[model samples]
Target: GSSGSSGPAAIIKPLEDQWVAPGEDVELRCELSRAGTPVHWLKDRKAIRKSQKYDVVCEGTMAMLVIRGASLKDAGEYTCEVEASKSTASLHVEEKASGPSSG
Candidate 1:
């Protein structure tokens, strides 16, 4: 008699695609079902790090990534990987109107 592996499943939410304007900020977060599990954040399949423009924080069962002053180059896909489960979302940056002369 044998039994399959039974463990808690990882849950990631708020992965829906988003739209933001240039010079604006956005926060992406994923809540895990359990604690003590490692979480990785990636942008276009590349690993992301904490910097002046980007802030990555993980505490307990919550993981978040914040981007300040988003630019056009920031528009792309973002993924949050937790344990064996993962979630992804697309970010689109919009340019603001330059002049207010004519509509």
Candidate 2:
């Protein structure tokens, strides 16, 4: 096959929905065409202001959003934007790690 794409800047891997326990950590994995890609995350259609509880890091061609102390409130739709491309995924958190109710 012949290469017909522009610079390796398009999204290669899209974010996948994840599940985590309260107070635990979770990471949304994303991979772009090339390394050193500049991007940011948005939650519920709003730009996520970087904070102590959450952070993002990019290594090589892969980027990840590591959320610390994740709880039910952190559950929402996440978006990774890169130039003209964007990826979205849903975050689901357990109310009780013990597992009893489904809510």
Candidate 3:
């Protein structure tokens, strides 16, 4: 008996905006319908492999884009590409923040 492989075909998530305090550790996570798949992280539509401030964590098909000591400059669109079942999914994330108004 040959059981057909079940997995995600394709998915796309538009860029998201988020506001948070500076120097805050944030983790951007997403769930994938495909199992045992590898998720790729991209910043500004570019591949990011190594960065002290950025970290990519994955757990059994799930992917997480983490940022340490987040700053205002880090605010931008982030895309996640998941390859599985001969398909791929793209997701985006945007981060924003404002400084103190009064002292």
Candidate 4:
């Protein structure tokens, strides 16, 4: 039966867009309606996990994804999902400035 798929509802807090330079850290976060539920983080449709470069933190209703030393490849859309609810935001990574090479 596909009557109601509202297993758990989420109320993601506003996550403002972020812009950072390469090697800098960035954080994306949101709040869920129920603090007991867990949030799943995704990037480019891939599941995100905690690693040396990534950290997932959830304290009560607040959940956050921290990326250490962000790079060009990290610039993209990110989503936080809780049941049927979701929050999306983009991360922009700026290239570092360097001396121009001889033309």
Candidate 5:
């Protein structure tokens, strides 16, 4: 057989579908086994605004994306995209109902 070499695969894990009440802070973070990659954060399939409402902290190979003052309006599918080498990995987060129970 010819020479063969293989590497590890990328990992993308979302904390989970958070169930937070309205008017509360929501912090979304992601972890990557490899570092020095381009990581992007998107909400509802669109890029997030780089303002106070959205914040991202990245160090080495570990990174985190935070969304402050989460509300029903901000509810939707959140995604984290990472591009490294010739491969990419992403994760999605969907909002769950946290309102008053019906009778």
Candidate 6:
């Protein structure tokens, strides 16, 4: 056989659908195994950027899409693309409760 080499296959798996109240923080995790490759985040098939509204953190084999103070506009289909592997999930946002504040 000819010379052969192997590398860890890129991993980006489906994340569980999430439901969160408005003004709450949410994290959409993308399990990316292979190192040195960039993982792109998309919302409704469009590329997402890191900003005050959204924070993207990549550490170890995990890529996190942190949404701070989630709002109705944040509800949508989210996607993670790494190499040839990809994953998608839905995020549902709802109004926060009117109950008393927590201690």
| Candidate with best TM-score | 2
The lDDT for every candidate, in the order shown, is 0.78, 0.82, 0.56, 0.77, 0.59, 0.78
Residue runs of model 4 more than 4 Å from their true location after superposition: 1-9, 96-103
Candidate 5 lDDT, 3-91, residue by residue in tens:
64543324455445666645677766556666656666667778876678887777655666666777666777766656642222233
Clash count of each predicted structure: 0, 0, 0, 0, 0, 0
lDDT of 1 by residue, 1-103 (tens): 6585566548656477888887789888777877677777788778887898788777677777789888778987888877878888999987766733323
State the lDDT of candidate 2 residue by residue for 5-101, as single tens digits: 6676779789887978877899887888787778878888888866776677788788888899888888999988887788989999877736656
lDDT of 4 by residue, 40-101 (tens): 77788899888888888877788878899897799877887677787888889876566232
Each prediction's TM-score against the native?
0.77, 0.82, 0.62, 0.78, 0.64, 0.81
Question: Residue 21 CA error for candidate 6 (Å)?
Answer: 0.7
**Any runs in candidate 6 off by more than 4 Å, and if so which?**
1-5, 97-103
Show where candidate 5 strays beyond 4 Å: 1-9, 84-103
Q: Quick one: ranking by TM-score, best first?
A: 2, 6, 4, 1, 5, 3
Shift in Å, residue 102, candidate 6: 19
Model 1: CA > 4 A from native: 1-9, 98-103
lDDT score for candidate 6 against the true structure: 0.78
10 residues in a row with least lDDT, candidate 3: 85-94
lDDT score at residue 14, model 3, on the 0-100 scale: 27
**Which of the two candidates, 1 or 4, achieves a greater TM-score against the reference?**
4
The per-prediction CA RMSD against the true structure, in angstroms, equals 3.9, 4.4, 5.3, 5.0, 6.3, 4.0
As for lDDT, the candidate ahead, 2 or 6, is 2
For model 1, the local distance difference test gives 0.78
The most accurate candidate by lDDT is: 2
By summed lDDT, the worst window of 10 consecutive residues in model 2 runs over: 94-103
Residue range 1-103, candidate 3, lDDT tens digits: 7578655633333224555555677677666565456666666667778467777776654566678876656665666665632222333223443445423
